[PDB]
Amino acid sequence: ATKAVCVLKGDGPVQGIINFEQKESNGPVKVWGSIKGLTEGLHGFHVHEFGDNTAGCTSAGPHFNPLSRKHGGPKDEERHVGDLGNVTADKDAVADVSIEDSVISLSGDHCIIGRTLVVHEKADDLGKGGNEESTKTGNAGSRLACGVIGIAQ
Amino acid sequence: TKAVCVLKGDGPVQGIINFEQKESNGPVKVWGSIKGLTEGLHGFHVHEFGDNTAGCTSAGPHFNPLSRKHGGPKDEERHVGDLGNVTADKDAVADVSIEDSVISLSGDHCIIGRTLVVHEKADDLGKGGNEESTKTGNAGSRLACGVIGIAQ
Ligand SMILES: *[Se]c1ccccc1C(=O)Nc1ccccc1
Ligand SMILES: *[Se]c1ccccc1C(=O)Nc1ccccc1
Ligand SMILES: [Zn+2]
Ligand SMILES: [Zn+2]
Numbered sequence: 001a002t003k004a005v006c007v008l009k010g011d012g013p014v015q016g017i018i019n020f021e022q023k024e025s026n027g028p029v030k031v032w033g034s035i036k037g038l039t040e041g042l043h044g045f046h047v048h049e050f051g052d053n054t055a056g057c058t059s060a061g062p063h064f065n066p067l068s069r070k071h072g073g074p075k076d077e078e079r080h081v082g083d084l085g086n087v088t089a090d091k092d093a094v095a096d097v098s099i100e101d102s103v104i105s106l107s108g109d110h111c112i113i114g115r116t117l118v119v120h121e122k123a124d125d126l127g128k129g130g131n132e133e134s135t136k137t138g139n140a141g142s143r144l145a146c147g148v149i150g151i152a153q
Numbered sequence: 154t155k156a157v158c159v160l161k162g163d164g165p166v167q168g169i170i171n172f173e174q175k176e177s178n179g180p181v182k183v184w185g186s187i188k189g190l191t192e193g194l195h196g197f198h199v200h201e202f203g204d205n206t207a208g209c210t211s212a213g214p215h216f217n218p219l220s221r222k223h224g225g226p227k228d229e230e231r232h233v234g235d236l237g238n239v240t241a242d243k244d245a246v247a248d249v250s251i252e253d254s255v256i257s258l259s260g261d262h263c264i265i266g267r268t269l270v271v272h273e274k275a276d277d278l279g280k281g282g283n284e285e286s287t288k289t290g291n292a293g294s295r296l297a298c299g300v301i302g303i304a305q
Contacts, residue, residue, distance in 0.1 A: 004266070004284055007205045051302015052157045052262060053266070054169055061305060113203070113266035114156070114303040148300035150203015151266040 003152035010057065010145025012037030018097060018117055020149065025107040030098035031084065034122040035119055036147070038089030041109055044140025045097075045123030047082035047104065047117040057143030060116035061135075066109050070135045073126030081110050083114070083138075087125050095119075098153040142146035155304035157280035158269040162209060165189030170249060171271040172301065175294040179205055183236065186288035187271055187297070190241030195291025196276030197249075199221030199256065199301070200268040201236035209295030212268035214288075222287045225301035226253055233262050235290075238276050247271075280291055 001023050010017030016035030022028070035043075036127050048060035063071060065084030072079035087095040090117050120140035129139050154177075160168035168187030173234030174180070187195075199211035215223060224231035233255055239247040256264050272292035279287050 003203075003207060028272075049303075051300065052304050053159045053299075053302070055156060071169065110237050111284045114301065116302065147205070149266065149304040150268065150300040151201075152203070152204050153202050 004106050004113050004149050005152040006037060006135070006149045007147045008035060008117065008119055008145040009147060012144065014119065014145035015039060016119065016145060019152070020106060020112070022106040023088055027090070028100050029104045029106060031097060031101060033097050035089070036088060036093055037094040037096065038095050038144070040089055040091050040094050042086035043086055043095065043144070044120035044122065044138055045084045045087045046117050046118050046120070047084065047112045048141070049125035051114045051116050051148040053116065053146060053148060057116070057118055057146035060118060060146060064112065064115050068116045071127045071138050074099070074103070076126070078127070079103065082115070085126060087119060090127065112149050115149055116146050118143045120144060156258050156265050156301050157304040158299040158301045160269065160271055160297035160299050162295065164296060165197050166270065166271060166296035168297060171304070174258040176210060177234050177257065180252045180254045181258060183249060183253060185249050187239060187247040187249065188245055190245050190271070190296070191240055192243050194238035194240055194275035195247065195296070196272035196274065196290055197239045198270050199236065199264045200270050201298040203268050204302065205268065205298065208303060209268070209270055209298035211299055212270060216264065216267050220303045223279045223290050226251070226255070228278065230279070231255065232243050237278060239259070239271060265303060267301055268298050270284045270295045270302055272296060
């Protein structure tokens with residue numbers, strides 16, 4: 001198995017720990033952990049292209065999109081590799097994250113190690129929104145917290 | 154290929170370190186700045202895990218894919234992660250300028266997704282007079298660290 005990990009940090013504190021595990025290179029990636037300090041509701045949850053936090057989460061650039069597709073939800077064929085949809089915070093300000101994804105990888109061209117995981121201000125409309133930005137960012141708004149995805153023990 | 158690392162920790166130490174590799178079989182240029190350091194040498198290493206779960210301790214040992222002993226960057230007998238020391242002046246600033254032929258941004262020596270750490274004390278480059286010299290270089294605690302990420 002390959003394992004990766006990401007510490008999310010941002011103002012609030014929006015603070016999170018996200019684990020990734022992939023049993024085989026041809027297999028799905030399990031994504032799990034917790035994020036605290038979130039407003040109740042949906043928050044867009046993406047892998048961004050650069051593992052660059054030089055000037056904060058903005059330095060990470062756009063959604064990780066190695067196949068040059070449009071933005072979508074994780075269940076869509078038409079999606080960025082980085083498109084992991086939304087995490088949900090309850091009134092406790094905590095998102096318990098539990099995702100399985102077949103498009104991200106911890107090996108190959110779709111590998112997310114060394115990239116940036118970001119949790120966003122607003123809901124990702126999964127590219128079903130009523131404007132042009134829907135097909136690029138999903139209108140998930142500002143970057144609340146982020147971290148670089150690293151190799152784990 | 155380009156990579157970058159933001160060094161942060163619990164205390165005054167913070168830095169930005171850039172990596173550039175023109176060809177996969179070529180050296181990696183390492184440059185940037187670290188502030189908040191005491192005057193003198195500070196061990197400067199790539200550690201095995203890009204894991205900052207509980208701060209710099211979670212990064213584990215020096216990145217050592219070839220199972221060698223600790224050394225300096227100009228030694229054959231070194232960990233891949235062994236980048237020696239950075240030097241802070243009385244200004245508390247280390248200006249970093251390294252070229253290294255053993256680290257890579259491609260292949261089995263790749264350091265992307267691992268942790269860069271700047272240490273409390275000098276790395277003795279494995280020439281110290283104790284057992285720990287051949288493992289850690291006696292560079293002491295981890296002042297600041299970050300995960301090495303892919304850059305634009
Ligand atoms: Se995984 C991983 C993590 C960081 C940087 C590169 C990779 C990787 O697997 N790279 C690679 C292999 C094959 C094709 C493109 C990229
Ligand atoms: Se580079 C890098 C950084 C972290 C993890 C993996 C790699 C990498 O490119 N490894 C590798 C992948 C594919 C082919 C050769 C080597
Ligand atoms: Zn997207
Ligand atoms: Zn070492």
